[PDB]
Design a protein around this ligand. Sequence first.
Ligand SMILES: NCc1ccncc1
Ligand SMILES: NCc1ccncc1
Ligand SMILES: NCc1ccncc1
Ligand SMILES: NCc1ccncc1
Lengths: 133, 133
Amino acid sequence: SKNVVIYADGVYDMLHLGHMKQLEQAKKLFENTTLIVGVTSDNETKLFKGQVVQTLEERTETLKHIRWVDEIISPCPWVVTPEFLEKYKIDYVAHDDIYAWLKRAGKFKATQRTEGVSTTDLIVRILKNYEDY
Amino acid sequence: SKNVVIYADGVYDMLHLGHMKQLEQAKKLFENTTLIVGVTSDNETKLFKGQVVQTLEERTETLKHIRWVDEIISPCPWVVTPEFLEKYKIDYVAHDDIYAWLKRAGKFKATQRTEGVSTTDLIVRILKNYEDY
Ligand SMILES: NCc1ccncc1
Ligand SMILES: NCc1ccncc1
Ligand SMILES: NCc1ccncc1
Ligand SMILES: NCc1ccncc1
């Protein structure tokens, strides 16, 4: 009934079906939702997580095309804070214990990952068309 | 004002930003539109055009996530006929002379391609992180 504001974040490098189904699942947590999507910066992703193929600007321009995405914060903060939830009027964080405070506040919503659909999995399928010998 | 029905078709293998921007451009040809997207079958694509990484079912499930896509015909016919336009009440075909009859009927609408954003271009960018020697 009342509109519920959902927040999900990530790298979204080389956007594939796995990200899409995750975002859809976040978007449909409730009947009436606004899904805000946060895109991690190149520097912090590279320092804290690992290598990223596409720049922040490219990764954001691709997310803009996904039907479930209502709003994008680019770049997003690397750590979600309670002050971040308050300023953007976020009701729930959708993710796939650093996150214990979100669970304690009733604001953690799980979303599953789909294995086997990644961009790299597809390139693996390309290479398997070449018998080793 | 009046709702205009747009049709675009293609393989949409390994969906990337290039396809997305093309679909957006088709969707925004007019103020009020319904964008129908046709997805070529595996057999006909492989026989007439060339190799396709993802099956028809996978290529369609990914397009379903694109915000501009209103309706999908999967599989679509390989050749667009006037009887196809009539049955689906298509007003315009958006594409990037086999298509001379569409131009003659006022139903051909061009959409441009974006070079440099393909899935394969990104894998090229990955491989360039490895100095040859
Ligand atoms: N992709 C992991 C991550 C998500 C949110 N903030 C930082 C890192
Ligand atoms: N669309 C947000 C953005 C714009 C320019 N650079 C990076 C991100
Ligand atoms: N991708 C080329 C094509 C588009 C429509 N029908 C057949 C082939
Ligand atoms: N979504 C249409 C479709 C379903 C099953 N196989 C291929 C295409």
